[PDB]
Amino acid sequence: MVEREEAVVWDILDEVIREHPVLLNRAPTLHRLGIQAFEPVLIEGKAIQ
Amino acid sequence: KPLVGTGMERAVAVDSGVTAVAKRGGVVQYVDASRIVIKVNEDEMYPGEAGIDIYNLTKYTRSNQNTCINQMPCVSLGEPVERGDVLADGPSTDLGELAL
Amino acid sequence: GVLKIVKVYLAVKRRIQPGDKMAGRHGNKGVISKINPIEDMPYDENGTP
Amino acid sequence: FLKPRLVDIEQVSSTHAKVTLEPLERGFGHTLGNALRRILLSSMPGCAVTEVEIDGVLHEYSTKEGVQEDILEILLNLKGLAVRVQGKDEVILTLNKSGIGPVTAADITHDGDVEIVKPQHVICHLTDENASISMRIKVQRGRGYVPASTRIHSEEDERPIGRLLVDACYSPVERIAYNVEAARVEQRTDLDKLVIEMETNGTIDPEEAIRRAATILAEQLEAFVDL
Amino acid sequence: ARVTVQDAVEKIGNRFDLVLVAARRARQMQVGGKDPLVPEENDKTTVIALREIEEGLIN
């Protein structure tokens, strides 16, 4: 299904990302609050806005 | 071309091997995208082996960092050259000027 | 051993994409950012934006 | 209120012109100014090289005996062809050339639908005496910026392996910028005027240009009206 | 979508055993158990559990 870019998975993609408490972690952090969390959104780009 | 330089710009483009130069100037004759054949003028010719200078071009080939060296022809057919004259300059060069 | 060998080359046309490192011969670096329109940039007496 | 309208289109050339709008009210020089500017700057019906089959091609990155650049760079020039069609969805432009001379945009098989605006547009050169080139430039019409890279994943089942897939840049426009100034009608206190300086290589007539754009806005407002 | 779940943090202060509760709860909404009462809207069951804590009906 993902192999065919099915319009099906696109709607399902919306459902599992629009509300995913994710961990934006930077490995080299020498501080606790350098590892925080956000909420991913379907964005047309090539980087993390 | 860069609107500013130092005077070593032609020292790069023209003298880096990136261009099919000529050791014995002459009327360009059989120029192709592979090899360039030059009919040598006798005022700058050594009587040895008649007079047919052979040259090889770096016309799009491979390079270390997955690159692809690119040669850009700068001289049109039908004109004599000189000892130190160019035929087709390499990458990022125009008629003999370094435009990194 | 090396008797039935093969040598094949593959070439790809590559154009600059957001995230490429452009700079200068002086010392200032830089990376191409978000692709911008053509004339939304301030132009001048010459005409080129 | 006097209805918005464009006066005689200031035509300096067939390729580029500048529309003039007299009956513009408070803020329309900017309203329509950008409401057209953006669409005019991207989505426009153009004709661009899709697939081309040249004869002397082992691979598109080859040095054909007689040409200055790559076979693909021959296609690089073909990428911005100033061809104008009348109705075909897709069309094949045959390019045959043998003899000492620059292969210009005149030695191409001149079809009735194929109307090149600039005949002297040199693609590549054929400088060798006894050499030859022969290809078929399959150009179609679309809109926007669509690359064969985003289209390369399929191969389209190619038996005639000479069908190299190249970049379809469908953008006839290049320079769209609007200016404003005091417009004076006979019945009104103050009106604005609009001067959209649009540039087209020679595929779509300036009026047909502003025609298509305005029409697409109409359709993109179709659904937008229902609450 | 949720911007602040500080409310959940206050209904059940453990913030750890809280995760074990919804843990077994997600299990019920998957492996047999019982159906999710609140009619879900795109939100995975993990977030559905988050909402049930804010209401404080299942802990």
How does this structure look, described?
Chain A has 49 residues and is α+β, with helices and mostly antiparallel strands. Chain A is 22% helix and 12% strand. Chain A has a two-stranded antiparallel ribbon. Chain B has 100 residues and is mainly beta. Chain B has a three-stranded antiparallel β-sheet, with no helix packed on it. In chain B, strands 4-5 form a two-stranded antiparallel ribbon. Chain B contains one helix and five strands. Chain E has helices at 6-11, 17-28, 45-55. Chains in contact: A-C, A-E, B-C, B-D, C-D. The PDB classes it as ribosome. The entry lists the keywords 30S subunit, RNA polymerase, complex, ribosome. Structure of 30S (S1 depleted) ribosomal subunit and RNA polymerase complex.
Short description:
This is part of a larger assembly, with one copy of chain A (49 residues), two copies of chain B, one copy of chain D (227 residues) and one copy of chain E (59 residues). Chain A is of the alpha+beta class. In chain A, 22% of the residues lie in helices and 12% in strands.
Structure class of chain E: mainly alpha
- The geometry of chain A reads as elongated
What's the number of helices of chain A? 1
Strand order of the largest sheet of chain A: 1-2
Shape of chain E: globular
CA radius of gyration of chain A: 15 Å
Q: What proportion of the residues of chain E form beta strands (DSSP E)?
A: under 5%
What assembly state would you assign to the polypeptide chains in this entry? part of a larger assembly
N- to C-terminal distance of chain A: 28 Å
| Cα distance spanning the termini of chain E | 22 Å
Helix-and-strand structural type of chain A? alpha+beta
What level of helicity do the residues of chain E show?
40-55%
Radius of gyration of chain E, in Å, reads 11 Å
Tally of helical segments of chain E: 3
> Which sequence of SSEs, written as H and E, runs from N to C of chain A?
HEE
Order of helices and strands of chain E: HHH
What fraction strand of chain A? 5-15%
Largest sheet features of chain A:
2 strands, antiparallel
GO cellular component, one term (chain D): DNA-directed RNA polymerase complex
Subunit structure (chain D): Homodimer. The RNAP catalytic core consists of 2 alpha, 1 beta, 1 beta' and 1 omega subunit. When a sigma factor is associated with the core the holoenzyme is formed, which can initiate transcription.
Family (chain D): Belongs to the RNA polymerase alpha chain family.
GO molecular function (chain D): DNA binding; DNA-directed RNA polymerase activity; protein dimerization activity
Keywords summarizing the entry:
part of a larger assembly, 5 chains, A: 49 residues, alpha+beta, two-stranded antiparallel sheet, elongated, D: 227 residues, five-stranded antiparallel β-sheet, three-stranded antiparallel β-sheet, 3 helices, 10 strands, 15% helix, DNA-directed RNA polymerase subunit beta' (chain A), DNA-directed RNA polymerase subunit beta (chain C), DNA-directed RNA polymerase activity (chain E), transferase (chain E), DNA binding (chain E)
